[PDB]
Design a protein around this ligand. Structure first.
Ligand code: 3PE
Ligand code: 3PE
Ligand code: 3PE
Ligand code: 3PE
Ligand code: 3PE
Ligand code: 3PE
Ligand code: EHZ
Lengths: 95, 178, 73, 276, 123, 55, 89, 124, 126, 65, 459
């Protein structure tokens, strides 16, 4: 085949114009003429949250509920003072 | 995408466009390179023979059995380039190819900056309106006697005239807007 | 900076896997024309064959060296 | 769900073996690992299923961004076919990729190992579908296979990428995060397993072939795949098996159930419910 | 996976146990006054250690120990290692039991097949 | 050209994802379940122009 | 950075020239832009298919069939590639 | 070729080939790019379904029947094998797990007042 | 295996006998049809590329489509069989199906509630 | 400024190689360190009993008859 | 409630007496404040309904609407300042007054104690609406659309007239308060089985049921934007408000006389939702979206469980606001595009960045995204429907999947994809267009924060 001698000129010429358009698209100097902080958003947000959690939630009923703490044999209960009885002796030492 | 589609396809362009699909669908099977370059110069052989068949009937009987051999020996995931239709980046950047007739509704403030840009844009818009007449007339004076009509459009053929129906092949949104 | 390009001559098929493909193709009588273009693949830098243990074991040498020392202390 | 998790594990894994898109292979692996996660939930082992979710997040995230590095560094090539020898051209991502690959394949003493083999041996020890038990284990060997497929094609092979080379991964924004997750991928399984609360009462007592099954199947999975990758290099035409295309076009669920349903659901609205 | 299945599924299952009913025969059968299992922990101790119901095994007692040494020794998650071996052992020593019970039920079922034929004296 | 919007949606995704994670009543679980779905729709098809992304 | 440097025509020009200088059939010391393939260098109807394909693999994009049944001159290839890639030099 | 005259409304609207815009040459400069349809060319009756973002009718390397049979065969074999599985399960040589008290009767939330039939577990 | 076009997965261009035709009549159409398209193409391309234009290019081929699809339907309706049988199975078929689906359920529910079996536990809402 | 290279092995920066060997070597140090300190990858540390060596007395297999 | 009404009437004098240039701002600014006086009715610090006076009352069900009816008049007058800005200065003052009378009448209808006051005002609203649709309707077919809108409502209306005069003779007063605290229990005769249909049918018609909804697609298509907003936001909901207050009587029959409608609506919900899936006219698709999302409501005002009712009240107020938002943005595309076709105008986000955000939020309101009153509404109707029969989830389950598909398709083929090459260049967005939207969604965001206000009479 090969381009037709009258299509290798409509691509000859129109490519020449596209090259000028893209040159014109180029911006002149000046073209755009316009006319620790970490603590900031970690601490300031925090105070607020705390204010909210210790003086609304905490205050209202059943808003922050927690699984009972774990108490094992032989460990003391701070609030009441009781000492959890030590468990029955493990007889085996077999590894 | 640029040139216009021919009405019917010749024998050649059908054969020579298999040599592409075929060899390119042989590089999905032959993931390596030395294996490929080997298994492919063997392909040309297949096309190289049966090159000088003068018996059209035969030729169109080798072609029709080639494209069925191929359809059943093609790779399901061919290696299609990243930016071509069916690819992985096809039309990805089109969300950034605004059509350029939109800078005409910009607020006089926006166009205030970017000053020389619009000074050159107003030149080109003068070019476009300055030739629509000579163009359409050309398009018409050269309407070949009514008959076969293809989508091919004429070149300029005279100095100063801008090769016609050009405002959208030139002034096309840039490919990668980025 | 008007990037230059390596001399086309530099590339040659001998010394690379393309050469063995070239020789069997020559046995059939085919000339393997574009083989020279596909040469830089095997030509240099990327010339060394990469073995699967090499990737899985990359850095093992120092890793064990590090282990021994730590084990000592 | 034990049953469907099991079917997705292999179905997705088998599809991944022939997929030639790097991102696609990793995504199928995302589905296959979750298929294993579904299996543990199906065997009523919730705590370990959650453990895999956390470990799964570290390594899969790595491999994707690893390929993000390869795709961006190359001229946006998303196909393993044109990408090769990244190991010498870009050791930083290749190192991250293999670290992630081995974690995906449950290399011993890496984050996948602490949670993944617990799940494997759980299967080998519970009462379960025989079909589910067999598919989950070969699914594990396939995970090694496609893992092998990625490094052989993407990393250990002669380069096949376009001739001009412009690769830079020096940008702190690439390395740093990749570096940080790599540290997680190396040490997270160690830290999470010891720290979590004792749960599930695992069964550590097994015949040794079941105790070591996850390790061996992963090893031969790569071994068999490496044989396969090696096979291709020869000048002899193998192409692929008839069920290979079945594998490559995703089991044909996309080709058939995506063209019939959207066609017979819209035809009925326009032609029957709307106009008639 | 295993041979045991092959026995039951392939061949004949007559003498192969059914997992759904492992203590299929008389519990005392074979043992004069066999001793029942014993639990060190207390129905409460567990309830106070918030052990998951499932984890309330006959090894619940070594668990509570582990958990103790895991809350204590908090910053150090790598030091309650002896406690874990113990728990595990207790459990391995339980899995074995659950295996001994299964083998015993197997053999006993066989006794039935042997005896039936033996007891099935021709005349 | 739109890096900031892309980062914006990624964190919105994280907010919906974490809400989905820590949700007591399931209505909130639903807010997360549907919520990640919609932002995935917005983010899978980041490059809206491409029909493949839209599909 | 990651994205390579934009192609400059005088480069793309050299790149297309170069690859051909590596095709054995095309003399390396005559390949001259404006040296048509089938009329001057002697290539055949089937070579062109390949010459184009090499270029499609040197520059990483697909020259469509209809637009590539005409990449004859060894230059059309140099402006078509550039026009498709927006290089105004 | 007018749509068949069965009085369902088609009227004179041309019956254009039922092929989706998916296989319309993807390189040609279609006036309407995304519908891959030129300006003036008769639109298809169901172009609201053949659009690219919807159904496709694009030739497939594997024949459609071959697809439907294979897919469903796989599905069936799998489903079946899963059944062979449930019939013949895999279970280790381990007897049943033994929980203390009365299988944790009270703690499984059992009624405190009504004691359960003791379920005892013996050694070995 | 021969590719087998189905209403979906149609016969590709290649593998299609018609493609392989040079009978001068066929080529005649194939070159006549480009003309219609070229003509229409050169009636879109110098009206869209026309400076000095603000009006909306209409694409009347789309206006002939919508009219054909929502305002040329009932003027071309003739009640036949295969149209009224199929025009009643579609409107009353499922509408009668679900009635015996919902009546039977609602009746099962009611009976059970009446006899005292339905638990309705912790259901304090409705 | 990385320079695009044509048909040549891209030049590599000091850091690229060292960071890559670093991450991989730590992977191997960790695998080796844990293997030594905790080799329960194989055998766990509890041996499977041979279910077929349990004296019939052990299981309550009554003397047949 | 004569401040929500008398000050309204006075709007009419202001539209007429005011200067041609200043007529628009006096009317829009004043009715914004008229809405502010409307907000006072929301102050219910006790359960007792607020009987302002003999004829005028406002209970939880009416109050959430009276405020919406007052709210849209400002918006309607802001969405029609463009078209209707090409008129002769006396055609405008007629359109503005027509819009003003609609909410005067609608405010009273929603705030009426006597059921026949509802009927007279109920059927009067057709006069203002038919004028808005027929006189200013752009298409050749509005004469037809007007006929459909007048006859379907009118043929339904005369049966209700006979029924309400009938109950007055049977009970002795049509006062909603008394009728509620009096024993009116129908007796399941064959005749009563007709009474029930007489009372509900007129309400079921303007609340498009699957059988009689063809009037709404035709009406909104050629209706001007202000008429389409009124029909979708307030006009259709007149039918729902009527069904809630009229079924206080006819208490026993609806237990078994509802099945026909319930099934008509739920199957209707699926088919109406589906045809949205392939409809080329955007205004057409929103209208069928309106039919389906209103088919859910007639299936909750008939199951009659507490949750249904307030599911209904939640959805009606919510869908009202959402639909208008969709009809309002559809108009903005229609005025620049000049065609209702959905296929044209593809890619707008590329050229109208924000309107697209409004389009996205409107679609997410259209489908059930969860932190929205729209979802709470459907979730509740869905629950009760499930209680009526567990199988209902299947049909109310095909609708949810279809509703997601058409809602996003409106976004995908209108506000994404490649830009249309060169339709008449699309002038940028006016600030009025964007506010008219913002005014619709900012209230949707605020109401979703405290759903209690629009929960209905039941809860
Ligand atoms: C995002 C979607 C919206 C989420 C809004 C969450 C906060 C809602 C809230 O409760 O804040 C207002 C509240 C008003 O006080 P009130 O509700 O009466 O509490 C009294 C308790 N006895 O609280 C107050 O006004 C008192 C001052 C509080 C100042 C800090 C508020 C922080 C709230 C954090 C909520 C975080 C959870 C939601 C977002 C995640
Ligand atoms: C004999 C006695 C031996 C006593 C010690 C026994 C071995 C204990 C090993 C514990 C290792 C824990 C660790 O190294 O954590 C690194 C961390 C792991 O993953 P991480 O990022 O925490 O993600 C999990 C989030 N839940 O990963 C990270 O935090 C990434 C941090 C990136 C920046 C690190 C910069 C310095 C790197 C130094 C490496 C040495
Ligand atoms: C064996 C059987 C195993 C069990 C059944 C498995 C299948 C169950 C149904 C799953 C959903 C079926 C439709 C799935 C969605 C879909 O197919 O959309 C894909 C379609 C085309 O996209 P695709 O070709 O995949 O990608 C482009 C590649 N160039 O993209 C489209 O936009 C298509 C049109 C989508 C919008 C309209 C679709 C119909 C909407 C209403 C009906 C929804 C489906 C039916 C109801 C739900 C059924 C579960
Ligand atoms: C698309 C998703 C579909 C998902 C389907 C899920 C089905 C779950 C199982 C439902 C059917 C079994 C229900 C069993 C309940 C307990 C047993 C029972 O008594 O059924 C309740 C009641 C009576 O049913 P049955 O026992 O069959 O008695 C029939 C007597 N002639 O039941 C009845 O009231 C009678 C009818 C029972 C069967 C109804 C089948 C409904 C089919 C729905 C089709 C959905 C698609 C429709 C088309 C959509 C697209 C256009
Ligand atoms: C609606 C009620 C409008 C009442 C307006 C009272 C003030 C007034 O005099 O306006 C009369 C109104 C407008 O008249 P004008 O201001 O002269 O401008 C239009 C000229 N045709 O022209 C009118 O006569 C409006 C009233 C028409 C009669 C029906 C009233 C109900
Ligand atoms: C069309 C949309 C649906 C419209 C439905 C219209 C139904 C008929 C009109 C209203 C019917 C009605 O009011 O029902 C009750 C009435 C008798 O009611 P009742 O007061 O019980 O009289 C018997 C006294 N022992 O029963 C009747 O009024 C019978 C009415 C006979 C005429 C039917 C309508 C003909 C229209 C032409
Ligand atoms: C893996 C993919 C499998 C594909 C396999 C492949 O189809 C095998 C095969 O084509 S088998 C040889 C068929 N070969 C022909 O069909 C050419 C015959 N056609 C002519 O000879 C013409 O008459 C002409 C003179 C124009 C040739 O001239 P030209 O070379 O087109 O320039």
């Amino acid at each position: 085949s090969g381009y037709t001698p009258d299509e290798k000129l409509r691509l000859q010429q129109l490519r020449e114009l596209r090259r000028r358009w893209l040159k014109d698209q180029e911006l002149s100097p000046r073209e755009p003429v316009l006319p620790l902080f970490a603590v900031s958003h970690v601490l300031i947000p925090m105070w607020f949250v705390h204010y909210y959690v210790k003086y609304h939630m905490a205050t209202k009923p059943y808003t922050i509920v927690s699984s009972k703490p774990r108490i094992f044999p032989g460990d003391t209960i701070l609030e009441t003072g009781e000492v959890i009885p030590p468990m029955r002796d493990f007889p085996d030492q077999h590894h | 995408a640029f040139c216009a589609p021919p009405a019917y396809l010749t024998h050649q362009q059908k054969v020579l466009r298999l040599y592409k699909r075929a060899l390119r669908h042989l590089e999905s099977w032959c993931i390596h390179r030395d294996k490929y370059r080997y298994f492919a110069c063997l392909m040309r052989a297949r096309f190289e023979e049966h090159k000088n068949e003068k018996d059209m009937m035969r030729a169109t009987q080798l072609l029709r059995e080639a494209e069925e051999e191929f359809w059943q020996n093609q790779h399901p995931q061919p290696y299609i380039f990243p930016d071509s239709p069916g690819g992985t980046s096809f039309e990805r950047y089109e969300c950034y190819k605004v059509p350029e007739w939109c800078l005409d509704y910009w607020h006089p403030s926006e166009k205030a900056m970017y000053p020389d840009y619009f000074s050159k844009r107003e030149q080109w818009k003068k070019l476009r309106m300055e030739s629509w007449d000579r163009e359409v007339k050309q398009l018409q004076e050269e309407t070949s006697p009514d008959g076969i009509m293809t989508e091919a459009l004429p070149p300029a053929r005279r100095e100063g005239d801008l090769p016609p129906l050009w405002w959208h092949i030139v002034t096309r949104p840039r490919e990668r807007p980025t | 900076g008007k990037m230059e390009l390596p001399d086309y001559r530099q590339w040659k098929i001998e010394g690379t896997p393309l050469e063995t493909v070239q020789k069997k193709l020559a046995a059939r009588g085919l000339r393997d024309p574009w083989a020279r273009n596909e040469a830089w693949r095997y030509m240099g830098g990327f010339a060394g064959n990469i073995t699967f243990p090499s990737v899985i074991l990359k850095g093992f040498k120092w890793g064990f060296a590090a282990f021994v020392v730590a084990l000592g202390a | 769900m034990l049953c469907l998790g099991a079917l997705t594990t292999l179905f997705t894994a088998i599809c991944a073996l022939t997929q030639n898109d790097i991102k696609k292979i990793i995504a199928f692996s995302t589905s296959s690992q979750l298929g294993l996660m579904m299996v543990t939930l199906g065997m009523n082992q919730p705590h370990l299923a959650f453990l895999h979710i956390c470990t799964h997040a570290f390594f899969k995230a790595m491999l994707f961004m690893c390929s993000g590095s390869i795709i961006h560094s190359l001229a946006d090539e998303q196909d393993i076919r044109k990408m090769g020898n990244i190991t010498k051209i870009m050791p930083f991502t290749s190192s991250c990729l293999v670290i992630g690959s081995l974690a995906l394949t449950g290399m011993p003493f890496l984050t996948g190992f602490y949670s993944k083999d617990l799940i494997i041996e759980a299967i080998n020890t519970c009462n379960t579908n025989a079909w589910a038990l067999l598919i989950t284990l070969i699914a594990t060997s396939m995970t090694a296979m496609y893992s092998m497929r990625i490094i052989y094609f993407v990393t250990m092979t002669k380069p096949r990428f376009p001739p001009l080379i412009s690769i830079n991964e020096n940008d702190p924004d690439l390395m740093n995060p990749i570096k940080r997750l790599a540290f997680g991928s190396i040490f997270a399984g160690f830290v999470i397993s010891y720290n979590i609360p004792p749960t599930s009462i695992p069964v550590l007592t097994m015949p040794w072939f079941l105790k070591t099954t996850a390790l061996i199947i992963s090893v031969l999975g790569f071994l068999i795949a490496l044989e396969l990758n090696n096979l291709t290099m020869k000048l002899s035409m193998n192409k692929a098996n008839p069920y290979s295309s079945f594998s490559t076009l995703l089991g044909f669920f996309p080709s058939i159930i995506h063209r019939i349903t959207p066609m017979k659901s819209l035809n009925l609205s326009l032609k029957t419910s709307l106009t008639l | 996976m295993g041979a045991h299945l092959t026995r039951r599924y392939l061949w004949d299952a007559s003498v192969e146990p059914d997992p759904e009913k492992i203590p299929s025969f008389p519990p005392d059968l074979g043992f004069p006054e066999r001793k029942e299992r014993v639990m060190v922990a207390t129905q409460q101790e567990m309830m106070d250690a918030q052990l998951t119901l499932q984890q309330r095994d006959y090894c619940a007692h070594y668990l509570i120990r582990l958990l103790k040494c895991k809350r204590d020794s908090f910053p150090n998650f790598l030091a309650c290692k002896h406690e874990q071996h113990d728990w595990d052992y207790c459990e391995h020593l339980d899995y074995v039991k659950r295996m001994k019970e299964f083998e015993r039920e197997r053999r006993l079922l066989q006794r039935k097949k042997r005896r039936a034929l033996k007891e099935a004296r021709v005349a | 050209p739109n890096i900031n919007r892309f980062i914006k949606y990624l964190t919105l995704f994280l907010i919906t994802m974490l809400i989905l994670t820590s949700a007591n009543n399931m209505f909130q679980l639903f807010i997360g379940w549907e919520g990640v779905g919609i932002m995935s729709f917005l983010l899978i098809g980041w490059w809206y122009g491409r029909t493949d992304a839209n599909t | 950075y990651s994205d390579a440097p934009p192609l400059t025509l005088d480069g793309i020009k050299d790149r297309v020239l170069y690859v051909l200088k590596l095709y054995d059939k095309i003399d390396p010391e005559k390949l001259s832009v404006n040296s048509h393939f089938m009329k001057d260098l002697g290539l055949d109807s089937l070579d062109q298919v390949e010459i184009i394909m090499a270029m499609e693999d040197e520059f990483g994009f697909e020259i469509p069939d209809i637009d590539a049944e005409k990449l004859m001159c060894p230059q059309e290839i140099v402006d078509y590639i550039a026009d498709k890639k927006d290089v105004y030099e | 070729e007018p749509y068949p005259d069965d009085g369902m409304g088609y009227g004179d609207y041309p019956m254009l080939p039922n092929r989706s815009q998916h296989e319309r040459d993807p390189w040609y400069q279609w006036d309407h790019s995304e519908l891959r349809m030129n300006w003036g060319e008769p639109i298809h009756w169901d172009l609201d379904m053949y659009i690219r973002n919807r159904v496709d009718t694009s030739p497939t390397p594997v024949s459609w029947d071959v697809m439907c049979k294979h897919l469903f065969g796989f599905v069936a074999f799998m489903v079946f094998m899963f059944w062979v599985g449930h019939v013949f399960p895999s279970y280790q040589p381990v007897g049943p797990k033994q929980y203390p008290y009365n299988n944790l009767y009270l703690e499984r939330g059992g009624d405190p007042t009504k004691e359960p039939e003791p379920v005892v577990h013996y050694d070995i | 295996s021969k590719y087998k076009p189905a209403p979906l997965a149609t016969l590709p261009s290649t593998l299609d006998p018609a493609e392989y035709d040079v009978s001068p009549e066929t080529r005649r159409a194939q070159v006549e049809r480009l003309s219609i398209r070229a003509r229409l193409k050169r009636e879109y391309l110098l009206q869209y590329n026309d400076p000095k234009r603000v009006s909306h290019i209409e694409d009347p081929a789309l206006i002939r489509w919508t009219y054909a699809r929502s305002a040329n339907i009932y003027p071309n309706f003739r009640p036949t069989p295969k149209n009224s049988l199929l025009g009643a199975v579609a409107g009353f078929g499922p509408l009668i199906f679900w009635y015996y689906v919902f009546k039977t359920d609602r009746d099962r529910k009611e009976r059970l509630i009446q006899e005292g079996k339905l638990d309705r536990k912790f259901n304090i809402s409705y | 400024h990385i320079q695009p290279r044509y048909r040549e092995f891209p030049q590599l920066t000091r850091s690229q190689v060292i960071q890559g060997e670093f991450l991989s070597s730590l992977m191997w140090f960790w695998i080796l360190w844990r293997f030594w300190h905790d080799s329960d990858a194989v055998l766990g540390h509890f041996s499977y009993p041979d279910p077929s060596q349990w004296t019939d007395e052990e299981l309550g297999i009554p003397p047949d008859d | 409630m004569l401040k929500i009404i008398l000050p309204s009437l006075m709007l009419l004098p202001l539209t007429w007496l005011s200067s041609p240039k200043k007529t628009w701002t006096n009317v829009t600014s004043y009715s914004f404040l008229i809405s502010l006086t409307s907000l006072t009715l929301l102050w219910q610090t006790d359960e007792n309904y607020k009987n302002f006076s003999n004829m005028f009352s406002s209970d939880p069900l009416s109050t959430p609407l009276i405020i919406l009816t007052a709210w849209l008049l400002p918006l309607m007058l802001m969405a029609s300042q463009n078209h209707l800005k090409k008129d002769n200065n006396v055609l405008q003052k007629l359109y503005i007054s027509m819009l003003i009378s609609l909410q005067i009448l609608l405010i009273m209808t929603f705030s009426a104690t006597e059921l026949i006051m509802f009927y007279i005002l109920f059927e009067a609203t057709l006069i203002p609406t038919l004028i808005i649709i027929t006189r200013w309707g752009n298409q050749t077919e509005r004469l037809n659309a007007g006929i459909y809108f007048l006859f379907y409502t009118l043929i339904g209306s005369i049966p209700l007239l006979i029924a309400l005069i009938l109950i007055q003779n049977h009970v002795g007063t049509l006062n909603l308060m008394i009728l509620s605290f009096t024993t009116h229990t129908l007796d399941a005769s064959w005749s009563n089985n007709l009474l029930w249909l007489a009372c509900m049918m007129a309400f079921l018609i303007k609340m498009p049921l699957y059988g009689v909804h063809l009037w709404l697609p035709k009406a909104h298509v050629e209706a001007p934007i202000a008429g389409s907003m009124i029909l979708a936001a307030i006009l259709l909901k007149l039918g729902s408000y009527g069904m809630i207050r009229i079924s206080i009587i006819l208490d026993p029959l609806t237990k078994y006389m509802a099945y026909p409608f319930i099934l008509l609506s739920l199957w209707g919900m699926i088919m109406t939702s589906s045809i949205c899936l392939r409809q080329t006219d955007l205004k057409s698709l929103i209208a069928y979206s309106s039919v389906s999302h209103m088919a859910l409501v007639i299936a909750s005002i008939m199951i009659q469980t507490p949750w249904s009712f307030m599911g209904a009240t939640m959805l009606m107020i919510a869908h009202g606001l959402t639909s208008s938002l969709l009809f309002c943005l559809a108009n903005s595309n229609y005025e620049r595009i000049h065609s209702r076709t959905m296929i044209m105008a593809r890619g707008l986000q590329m050229v109208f960045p924000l309107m697209a955000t409004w389009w996205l939020m409107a679609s997410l309101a259209n489908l059930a995204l969860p932190p929205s009153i729209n979802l709470m509404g459907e979730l509740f109707i869905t629950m009760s429907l499930f209680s009526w029969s567990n199988f209902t989830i299947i049909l109310m389950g095909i609708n949810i999947i279809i509703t997601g598909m058409y809602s996003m398709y409106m976004i995908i083929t209108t506000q994404r994809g490649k830009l249309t090459n060169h339709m008449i260049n699309l002038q940028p967005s006016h600030t009025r267009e964007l506010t008219l939207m913002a005014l619709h969604m900012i209230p949707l965001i605020l109401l979703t924060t405290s759903p209690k206000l629009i929960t209905g009479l039941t809860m």
